[PDB]
Design an enzyme around this catalytic site. Structure first.
Site, PDB file in Angstrom:
ATOM      1  N   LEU D  38     -27.484 -21.669 -15.217  1.00 57.54           N
ATOM      2  CA  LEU D  38     -27.087 -22.331 -13.983  1.00 57.54           C
ATOM      3  C   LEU D  38     -26.804 -21.275 -12.915  1.00 57.54           C
ATOM      4  CD1 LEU D  38     -24.855 -25.310 -15.118  1.00 57.54           C
ATOM      5  CD2 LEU D  38     -27.339 -25.097 -15.069  1.00 57.54           C
ATOM      6  N   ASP D  39     -26.209 -21.704 -11.809  1.00 58.87           N
ATOM      7  CA  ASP D  39     -25.809 -20.809 -10.736  1.00 58.87           C
ATOM      8  C   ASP D  39     -24.314 -20.546 -10.813  1.00 58.87           C
ATOM      9  OD1 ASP D  39     -24.849 -19.692  -8.335  1.00 58.87           O
ATOM     10  OD2 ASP D  39     -26.539 -20.506  -7.203  1.00 58.87           O
ATOM     11  N   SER D  40     -23.926 -19.314 -10.479  1.00 58.44           N
ATOM     12  CA  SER D  40     -22.509 -18.983 -10.403  1.00 58.44           C
ATOM     13  C   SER D  40     -21.779 -19.967  -9.512  1.00 58.44           C
ATOM     14  CB  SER D  40     -22.336 -17.566  -9.865  1.00 58.44           C
ATOM     15  OG  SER D  40     -22.789 -17.502  -8.528  1.00 58.44           O
TER      16      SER D  40
END
Ligand code: PC1
Ligand code: 3PE
Ligand code: NDP
Ligand code: SF4
Ligand code: SF4
Ligand code: SF4
Lengths: 210, 320, 176, 84, 115, 388, 158
Positions: D38-40
């Site tokens: 995923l994204d931070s």
């Protein structure tokens, strides 16, 4: 004073006093003051390193020979031809001595200047305006935000590279029953007249060659 | 295209599109969006009207300077009709009523007036034309509104064989008289009187969807002579809708007004259209063909009835 | 040189105090307030009767821009674009081409009576007294487009009012 | 009341709600950066989701280390203070 | 030389902190915004839009700039929180009325001149 | 903070001072904080002026403070004269002073009356406004425009006074002082008026200096300072008038100060009519003062200088300056900056109402909600120059 | 008595068209210099009240709006909001030159180029400012414009 109704009578006495009062501040705060100059229409100019905003403004406000109680004006002059494009300017009044001095600094978009609100409560809003219209940020300002522009104005108007007609013009739409925004379209474009005369106007101010 | 109608600009308010549209009966609920969309891109628009010039004011902001014109005309007259269509690049007929008067019965507004307009456009050599027919058109239909409508769909297809007749289903929107019909008229001061609304299937469409369809039709060159119908993407039952409506409107519900001067409400013939089923016509091209997607009634029913809602609702179950 | 506005000391003598005490319990100064108003009731109202009467004006008054003609009838304007270049609001648009007889004259001349600020600069900069401002001001219109005067509208107004524009200019050209 | 097992339960269930996460690769020791990938930015929503789920504040500086579902179990151990 | 006066964050590692702090500020506010203004977009839509504006600034690298971008965000949020904005100002991020602007080459060559 | 209210003047009432959106933080009956929002009328005047010639820009200064018009133009004119290094002819300096006082009469009548209109005192609004109508004609009979005269320009004025005007201004002045005495006969001694503007909005002498106040705000709390006395500009050094000074510092004194200033204007006009000198009305320097039509239509050089001064304007020497005047509301000035071209590089406008409004928060502390009416009014705030 | 349907409509239609113009209660938007003239028009000299045009009315019980002055982008939403709260009939009158086409500030980023964009205007009054007498002409002109309304006749012919 002279007998020439079409010329401005010089007041040299006041001019001499400023020059005398010139070194007075140049000697006292040499850590900041870069350049002090006096204009022929009796207006003193003090050039200060930006850091010295508080030391210098606070001094004149309270020193026993300046006593500049009231802040006349506070603005900035966008100048895109310099590395520090912006240029703050403080205009100070002195009821006791009945004189005015002008103090200028230099900054840019990303180098904030310490809020002078502690020195004068007058600059509570003038510093909001400078940020609002020019983009310069003031450190430690009690409450910094837009004061003039419309909410969510994605830009800083008074910069020299901001088109006069803006980027969005409003209008009312019935389909959505609310005011809206769109890219600006003008029924008639703003005609841009070119006025500069190609002949040197004042030889005194001539900029020497490169 | 004519020299003065060549496209220019970026399609904003003051940009020139090149669509000199003449809208008949633009004062109606459907028209004001068509006018607004035409005005949006700055297309020249002529707007004949019959009511007071005061009633046309709300259209004025919708157009730039000198793009909206408010002439006068009369259905019984054709001299007036010719002036409004003399140099139009397209003509749109949106006339219609939900009730009959002692001046113009259903046939007059649905047969002769749609026709009389069509012929003059042919006489004047109008290059295009649009006509709003009804999805449920049939001469053997019960609803005189529909039976009167069914006649018009034929002459318009005959007098102007290239006119793009369109047959949308029930339409809803902020000013619509369908979703607002159930919420206020059906219930206010009167317990619901639904006559076993269990068999009917209703497939309304969003007004914006219809409006976008019409404009896309004007631009298309291949749309000449075809026929379209616009229907929402999800079918529904009459009874299911009304019950769901009161959930959004938060009005009390109990499952199960005459004809007068002014604008009547709950007319005798209007009932037949509420009960009348929405025809299923899989062969006729619809919205999806015009580069327009139907917007589900769930997404947009919120705004229309938000005002009805005085001062977390499962969307209505569908019926295949 | 200054002066004091509110520095009165109420003398504490009984009679003086009784007056300030008399003032409060008898509202006398308030009774006086009802006096000034009563007088104005019996004065003569300064209301004129419009439109049967008009508010006095002066020859210098500024109104509806108009374009003049010589006594012969010829247009005075020679399309020098001074008025365009000075109109602060840029409400003036001008075009010109050599007329059939090879005389500098306009072809398109437009004034936007909604962008105009009615400053009078246009009539100042005209070297031939062509574009002026007549004494008319009752020209409100029901539509925005009507308030965009082009060459034809300006010429008609000039001809329409010229019987008066010259009369005003006659009495006032000396001050200029 | 404490149910240190429950911490392992809700956390796995909660990450199921996060639409981005595919159920199959979810595990008590799945890797957000590479497994889920995923994204931070996304993991911040997850941390916020847990705050509501466990009903208390979670510092950001801690949140910049909870890269695996286990650490939500482990880190919340001290916060909850359940010592099964 | 690169000696430059910072505003708030002395390095990206600290600067990126406020970004995540800020994102939560919006992420927890979108639900209030929709109900406060009685907008007609689901709470889901707002956060998705929010990510976009944050996402388009991912390429940034200057510590000062991120401080500035952050500083504007608080003002935008503070107006939203206090209801200083108005229903109109809230929806200006979504561009409802604007019709689809063509973006591929052959679309441009059919409609006008703008490259 | 208990219940913050966005008190708005957007539905403007009959006060004609602008539109103000006010955000406050009450504590029950008493107000505790304020936060004016002033963007509602920002037109961008300070940015357009960078595209105009100094001549073309003059009408803007007329529309900053739209109740003290000719005073505004004088402020701008002095700045350009100062940078041009030329002096207007002595006759011009009297005309400009002659209307500065008349404008100051116009401003105060609006200030005192509307300040009384807001508090329900409605009759004094009309009586004095009738005189405003008579004074408008003097504006109209010299410049042809009732309000935005643009009569005053860099280099003097535009047209000389018409015949029979000074003989008619005298008629107005003579009977005017009777008008004020009627005004005082319903405001000063009236107890209801006293209850509203005594011990209200008291400003400490030191604070007034620090916040950046000027005009009746400074002189309303004892401070002896009037630029017409310390830094005279045109002829004020050659007239006699007493700068009224209050001592309490409340609103009442400022109301007294304004009423007293109007009387001190008549004492000046009486001296302007008697001392008006003869001569020309504009600097006899054609390169800055376009010639009269008589010479333009006759002489070569007289035409060229009427063909450049109305298309390109006059160049100004490079430089910058700040010039201020005792405008009716307070100190008014411009930080004009010229880079040698016929168009100003920058022009900051120090609106006296800008500082007097920021300081509203300070003055509003610990006063009822209804008192902000009598506090905003006493400052004579016109949002034309607040926003510009 | 006797009269055709058309005739009785005209006379009872003529009545209301007279009432709705002999008694106008104008909301005032004092946004800029042209606000001052609106005050003079009510001042003693002209006494706009002498025609029944009262001075102050609740914005939600108005009868006509006189947009006076510039219309900033910031202030635009408020104007539209006020417009929607006006009970019908509602006639909007544009006063001045900045409320018509942006006047002096036509090319200002933060100025709505003509209030007509935000609402449909009925009468346009030129002049910056329109002399207090000219504004009065517009109001009188508006009453006639009302006097040329034939609602019921059109209704009878529906
Ligand atoms: C029949 C009853 C129906 C119910 C109605 C309501 C109850 C009855 C209340 C009636 C009140 C009386 C209204 C009288 C109006 C007269 C106005 C007037 O003075 O004239 C000057 C007006 C003023 O005209 P103006 O507005 O153009 O004036 C311009 C300004 N000046 C004057 C300064 C130059 O003249 C007219 O315009 C014509 C008025 C026509 C009035 C029509 C209605 C009459 C009443 C109905 C009777 C119909 C009988 C059947 C046919
Ligand atoms: C009402 C008619 C108009 C009245 C005109 C004014 C007038 O005649 O009276 C004014 C008079 C002056 O009062 P004043 O200015 O205060 O000087 C005295 C100081 N003690 O003030 C008076 O002396 C008037 C006193 C009137 C009597 C008091 C009110 C009694 C009310 C019950 C009867
Ligand atoms: N919701 C629906 O009914 C759907 C829409 N349609 C069709 O769309 C069309 C437009 O929709 P909508 O706007 O809601 O209809 P409207 O009821 O609003 O009327 C449309 C226009 O027709 C005018 N009109 C009525 N009688 C006449 C007449 N004798 N002569 C001239 N004009 C007249 C009306 O003006 P005035 O008010 O002054 O009479 C109005 O401007 C309708 O005709 C309808 O058949 C088809 C399928 C579903
Ligand atoms: S009066 Fe001034 S603004 Fe109006 S058209 Fe003439 S020059 Fe232009
Ligand atoms: S200044 Fe006069 S002569 Fe020159 S273009 Fe304008 S109207 Fe014509
Ligand atoms: S229209 Fe006239 S009064 Fe109004 S702001 Fe513009 S110039 Fe001033």
């Amino acid at each position: 004073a002279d007998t020439r109704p079409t010329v401005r009578p010089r007041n040299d006495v006041a001019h001499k006093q400023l020059s005398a009062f010139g070194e007075y501040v140049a000697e006292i705060l040499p850590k900041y003051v870069q350049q002090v100059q006096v204009s022929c229409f009796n207006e003193l100019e003090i050039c200060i390193h930006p850091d010295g905003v508080i030391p210098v403004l606070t001094f004149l406000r309270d020193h026993s020979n300046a006593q500049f109680k009231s802040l006349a004006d506070l603005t900035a002059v966008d100048i895109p031809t310099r590395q520090n494009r912006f240029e703050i300017v403080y205009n100070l009044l002195s009821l006791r001595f009945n004189s005015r001095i002008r103090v200028k600094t230099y900054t840019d978009e990303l180098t904030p200047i310490e809020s002078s609100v502690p020195v004068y409560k007058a600059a509570n809003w003038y510093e909001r305006e400078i940020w609002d219209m020019f983009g310069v940020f003031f450190a430690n300002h009690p409450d910094l935000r837009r004061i003039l522009t419309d909410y969510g104005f994605e830009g800083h108007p008074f910069r020299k590279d901001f088109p006069l007609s803006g980027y969005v013009e409003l209008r009312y739409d019935d389909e959505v029953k609310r005011v809206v925004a769109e890219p600006v379209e003008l029924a008639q474009e703003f005609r841009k007249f070119d006025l500069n005369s190609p002949w040197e106007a004042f030889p005194a101010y001539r900029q020497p060659p490169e | 295209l004519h020299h003065a109608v060549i496209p220019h600009g970026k399609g904003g308010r003051s940009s020139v599109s090149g669509i000199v549209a003449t809208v008949f009966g633009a004062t109606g609920f459907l028209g004001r969006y068509v006018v607004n969309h035409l005005g949006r891109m700055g297309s020249q628009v002529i707007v004949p009207h019959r009511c007071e010039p005061y009633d046309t004011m709300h259209l004025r902001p919708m157009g730039d300077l000198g793009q909206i014109i408010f002439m006068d005309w009369n259905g019984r007259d054709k001299d007036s009709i010719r002036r409004a269509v003399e140099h139009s690049s397209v003509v749109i007929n949106l006339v219609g009523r939900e009730w009959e008067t002692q001046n113009f019965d259903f046939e007059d507004v649905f047969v002769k007036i749609p026709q009389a307009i069509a012929q003059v456009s042919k006489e004047a050599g109008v290059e295009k034309f649009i006509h709003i027919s009804h999805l449920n058109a049939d001469i053997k239909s019960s609803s005189k509104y529909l039976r009167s409508k069914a006649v018009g769909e034929k002459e318009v297809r005959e007098t102007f064989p290239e006119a793009t007749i369109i047959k949308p289903a029930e339409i809803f929107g902020r000013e619509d008289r369908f979703l607002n019909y159930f919420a206020n008229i059906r219930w206010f001061g009167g317990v619901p009187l639904i006559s076993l609304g269990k068999k009917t299937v209703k497939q309304p469409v969003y007004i914006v969807d219809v409006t976008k369809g019409i404009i896309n039709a004007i631009k298309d060159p291949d749309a000449r002579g075809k026929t379209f119908a616009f229907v929402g993407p999800s079918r529904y039952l009459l009874f299911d809708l009304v019950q769901y409506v009161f959930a959004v409107a938060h009005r009390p519900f109990l499952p199960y007004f005459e004809i007068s001067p002014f604008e009547p409400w709950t007319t005798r013939d209007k009932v037949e259209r509420i009960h009348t089923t929405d025809k299923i016509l899989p062969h006729l091209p619809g919205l999806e063909d015009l580069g327009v997607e139907a917007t589900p009634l769930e997404l947009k029913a919120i705004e229309v009835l938000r005002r009805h809602r005085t001062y977390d609702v499962q969307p209505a179950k569908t019926i295949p | 040189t200054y002066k004091y506005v509110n520095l009165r000391e109420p003398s504490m003598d009984m009679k003086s105090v009784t007056d300030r005490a008399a003032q409060t319990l008898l509202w006398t100064e308030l009774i006086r307030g009802l006096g000034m108003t009563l007088s104005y009731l019996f004065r003569e109202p300064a209301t004129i009767n419009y439109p049967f009467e008009k508010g006095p004006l002066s020859p210098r008054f500024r109104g509806e821009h108009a374009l003049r003609r010589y006594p012969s009838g010829e247009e005075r304007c020679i399309a020098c674009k001074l008025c365009e270049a000075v109109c602060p609001a840029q409400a003036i648009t001008i075009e010109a081409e050599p007329r059939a007889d090879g005389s500098r004259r306009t072809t398109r001349y437009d004034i936007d009576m909604t962008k105009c600020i009615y400053c009078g600069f246009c009539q100042e900069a005209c070297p031939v007294d062509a574009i002026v401002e007549g004494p008319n001001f009752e020209f409100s219109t029901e539509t925005h487009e009507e308030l965009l005067y082009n060459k034809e509208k300006l010429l008609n107004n000039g001809d329409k009012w010229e019987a008066e524009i010259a009369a005003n200019i006659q009495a006032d050209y000396l001050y200029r | 009341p404490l149910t240190l097992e429950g911490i392992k339960d809700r956390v796995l269930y909660v990450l199921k709600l996060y639409d981005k996460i595919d159920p199959e690769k979810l595990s008590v020791n799945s890797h957000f950066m590479k497994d889920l990938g995923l994204d931070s930015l996304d993991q911040v929503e997850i941390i916020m989701a847990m705050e509501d789920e466990f009903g208390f504040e979670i510092p950001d500086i801690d949140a910049e280390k909870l890269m695996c579902p286990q650490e939500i179990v482990d880190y919340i151990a001290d916060k909850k203070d359940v010592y099964e | 030389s690169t000696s430059v006066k910072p505003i708030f964050s002395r390095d990206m590692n600290e600067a990126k902190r406020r970004v995540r702090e800020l994102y939560r500020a919006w992420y927890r506010e979108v639900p209030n915004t929709v109900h406060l203004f009685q907008l007609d977009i689901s709470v889901k839509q707002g956060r998705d839009k929010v990510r976009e504006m944050f996402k388009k600034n991912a390429h940034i690298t200057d510590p000062r700039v991120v401080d500035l971008l952050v500083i504007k965000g608080k003002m935008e949020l503070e107006e939203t929180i206090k209801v200083w904005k108005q229903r109109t100002h809230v929806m200006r991020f979504f561009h409802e009325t604007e019709a689809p602007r063509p973006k591929d080459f052959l679309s441009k060559f059919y409609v006008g001149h703008d490259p | 903070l208990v219940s913050n209210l966005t008190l708005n003047f957007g539905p403007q009432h009959p006060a004609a001072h602008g539109v103000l959106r006010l955000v406050m933080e009450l504590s029950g009956e008493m107000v505790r904080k304020c936060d004016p929002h002033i963007g509602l009328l920002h037109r961008g005047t300070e940015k357009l002026i960078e595209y105009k010639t100094y001549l073309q820009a003059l009408p803007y200064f007329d529309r900053l403070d739209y109740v003290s018009m000719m005073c505004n133009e004088q402020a701008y004119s002095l700045a350009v004269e100062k940078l041009l290094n030329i002096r207007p002819p002595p006759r011009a300096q009297w005309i400009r002073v002659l209307f500065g006082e008349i404008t100051r009469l116009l401003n105060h009548i609006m200030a005192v009356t509307t300040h009384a209109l807001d508090i329900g005192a409605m009759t004094p609004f009309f009586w004095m406004f009738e005189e405003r109508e008579k004074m408008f004609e003097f504006y109209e009979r010299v410049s042809g425009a009732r309000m935005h005269a643009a009569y005053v320009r860099p280099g003097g004025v535009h047209q000389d006074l018409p015949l029979g005007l000074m003989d008619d201004i005298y008629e107005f002045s003579k009977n005017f002082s009777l008008r004020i005495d009627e005004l005082e006969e319903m405001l000063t001694n009236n107890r209801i008026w006293r209850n509203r503007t005594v011990d209200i909005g008291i400003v400490t002498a030191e604070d007034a200096l620090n916040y950046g106040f000027s005009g009746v705000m400074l002189r309303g709390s004892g401070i002896q300072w009037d630029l017409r006395k310390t830094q005279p500009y045109d002829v004020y050094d050659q007239v006699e008038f007493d700068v009224p000074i209050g001592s309490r510092g409340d609103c009442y004194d400022r109301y007294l100060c304004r009423v007293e200033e109007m009387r001190q204007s008549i004492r000046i006009i009486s001296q302007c009519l008697n001392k008006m000198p003869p001569g020309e009305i504009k600097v006899d320097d054609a390169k800055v003062s376009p010639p009269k039509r008589a010479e333009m239509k006759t002489s070569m050089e007289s035409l060229i200088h009427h063909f450049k001064l109305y298309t390109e304007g006059y160049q100004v020497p490079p430089g910058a300056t700040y010039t201020a005047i005792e405008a009716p509301k307070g100190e008014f000035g411009v930080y004009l900056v010229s880079d040698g071209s016929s168009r100003p590089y920058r022009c900051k406008i120090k609106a006296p109402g800008f500082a007097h409004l920021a300081g509203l928060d300070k003055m509003s502390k610990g006063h009822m909600l209804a008192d902000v009416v009598a506090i905003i009014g006493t400052q004579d705030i016109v949002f034309g120059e607040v926003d510009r | 008595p006797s009269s055709r349907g058309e005739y009785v409509v005209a006379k009872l239609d003529d009545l209301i068209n007279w009432a709705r113009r002999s008694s106008l209660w104008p909301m005032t938007f004092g946004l800029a210099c042209c606000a001052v003239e609106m005050m003079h028009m009510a001042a003693p000299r002209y006494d706009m009240d002498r025609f029944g045009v009262v001075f102050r009315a609740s914005p939600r019980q108005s009868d006509v709006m006189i947009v006076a002055g510039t219309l900033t982008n910031k202030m635009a939403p408020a104007l539209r909001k006020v417009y929607d709260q006006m009970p019908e009939p509602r006639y909007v009158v544009s006063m001045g030159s900045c409320a018509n086409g942006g006047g002096y500030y036509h090319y200002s980023y933060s100025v709505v180029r003509g209030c007509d964009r935000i609402v449909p205007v009925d009468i346009y009054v030129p002049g910056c400012p329109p002399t207090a007498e000219a504004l009065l002409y517009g109001i009188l002109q508006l009453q006639k414009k009302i006097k040329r309304e034939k609602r019921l006749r059109i209704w009878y012919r529906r």
